[PDB]
Amino acid sequence: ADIQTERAYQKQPTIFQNKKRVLLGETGKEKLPRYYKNIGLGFKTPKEAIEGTYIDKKCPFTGNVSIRGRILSGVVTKMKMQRTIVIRRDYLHYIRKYNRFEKRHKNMSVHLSPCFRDVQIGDIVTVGECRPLSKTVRFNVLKVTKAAGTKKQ
Template sequence: MKNIGLNIEQPTTDCDDHHCPFHGQISIRGKLIQAKLIKNKARRTAVVRIEFFHYVKKYMRYEKRRRNIIAHISPCLNVNDNDSVTIGECRPLSKNVSFVVLGRTS
């Protein structure tokens, strides 16, 4: 198990996934985001939702917006739907996947 250089709890189980940040060859660089895991149905892939506020200059108010991000889940991580998770940016793993789930946040 390699040290990814972040203050994130490492998983207890091992895996042989090449895209695992703890056991594989993926390095985390760029953004670290805390979000809510929405769907976990695809194989080793999850949909994560980020909610944020956007300022509307015309009305001098904030509106709530959200964005869905597709992230890779390693089999050594035990996360379920509606969990609060931390995701980290990595190199593009596929056409739409450029983030990896790093673990559950408390």
């Protein structure tokens, strides 16, 4: 519900909240300033990252990761394991002797920031390489594309 659900106070490290709030200000409404950055490579910052209130230190827009290296794509298959999803990347492997292909796949775990709210199984995501964020996570979700949906019953 609220964002302070941990044992330690959750805050963006580069925002000073206690900026001498005195009688000349309104009580309220006050809204504490939000740190966000523009990652390069022509990727738009989602508006939910602009005026959201989540704290995520591994978010590419409001956190302390920097995207560099490889930009890949895949299809969401699991959405357990909080703030992290499993995507599947299918590809064809060429075998020279029979001069045909075979179908292979690899899973990678990627960090899904809470600026992407309506993410479902079967969606196509764009991921960017960052520094190691955990034992197995090295990529971070940059853009979510819906697949054959947008209309429900």
